[PDB]
């Protein structure tokens, strides 16, 4: 409808410094550094003070304005991943065949190896994204821990694990086997 101005406020906490130039966003915190490129969006940024940043769209229509909240949420995930971390938990679900999951290394590169899924002889390997750590949890039986600074990478790599274990040619309501994301939270609470 061509709204004259739309604003969003980024709350940037005590231990972070969000550096922005030409829609390239670099968020430094106690757990490291995260970068995001936003050259595909027409937005502008204002430093209100050290603890707040204003994000603005001028003369935007409905969809251009819809992108504004998305921009703010993405940068906020950057901040909360550089200060609090991100941790996704996966549980192994099976009826008869135990799912054997190991973190192996080939070509000097880390992989997640899933064996005996529904008794299949095929072995499944999922490449581990950069900055994402996998860890077989010890407190809980049959649980995988996916952690990292980037919410996007951690969630995508957990989804890669969940999608590789789809059941074919069966009633999935009955054959409920798989590896599913059970908890989505933060490393430090």
């Amino acid at each position: 409808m061509k709204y004259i101005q739309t604003d969003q406020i980024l709350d940037i906490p005590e231990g972070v410094t969000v550096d922005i130039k030409a829609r390239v966003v670099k968020v430094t915190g106690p757990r490291g550094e995260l970068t995001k490129d936003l050259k595909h969006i027409d937005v502008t940024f204002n430093k209100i003070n050290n603890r707040a940043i204003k994000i603005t769209v001028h003369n935007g229509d409905r969809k251009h304005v819809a992108a504004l909240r998305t921009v703010k949420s993405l940068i906020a995930n950057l901040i909360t991943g550089v200060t609090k971390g991100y941790k996704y938990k996966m549980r192994f679900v099976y009826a008869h065949f135990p799912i054997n999951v190991n973190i192996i290394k080939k070509d000097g590169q880390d992989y997640v190896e899933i064996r005996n899924f529904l008794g299949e002889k095929r072995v499944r390997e999922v490449k581990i994204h950069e900055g994402v750590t996998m860890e077989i949890s010890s407190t809980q039986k049959d649980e995988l821990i996916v952690s990292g600074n980037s919410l996007e990478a951690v969630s995508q790599n957990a989804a890669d694990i969940q999608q590789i274990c789809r059941v074919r040619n069966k009633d999935i309501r009955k054959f409920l086997d798989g590896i599913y994301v059970s908890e989505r939270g933060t490393i430090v609470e």
Binding site: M1, K2, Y3, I4, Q5, D42, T44, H58, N59
Partner: protein, 171 residues
Amino acid sequence: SRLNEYQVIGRNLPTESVPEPKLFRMRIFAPNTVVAKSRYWYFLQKLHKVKKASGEIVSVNIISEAKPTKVKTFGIWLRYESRSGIHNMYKEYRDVTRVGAVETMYQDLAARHRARFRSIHILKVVELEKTDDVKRQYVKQFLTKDLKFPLPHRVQKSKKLFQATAPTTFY
């Protein structure tokens, strides 16, 4: 420049029974006086049972804007015909003259409703004196405190086909 506002005054031709027929006035938005009188007769023939042949135009006069350099918000009430029926609607415009707002309304109903000039009756054009009389947000957002806004992505219009310097859009 497309339109002017006219008053058109007319009556029935005097007869022995009615020597002093009533005078009727209309406010007509027209390109010229020929169209103005035509619109007057069109509306008088729809409202009252009077034809052009038994009446006469008494007066045609330009009505100029009182304050042509004062920014105003206008409310306009309309009856228009769509492809499928007849509808009433009310819209708001910002301009410095009534004729400017009416020209914008004609463009706007052409653009959004495919409503040609022949399909629109202007019920009433009113200058909205108070900010509370302004109802539509697409005009209400220009009535706020300390209004300011940039004009990003300026495209400069060149007089030559080939430019020896890289394009810029700053402003």
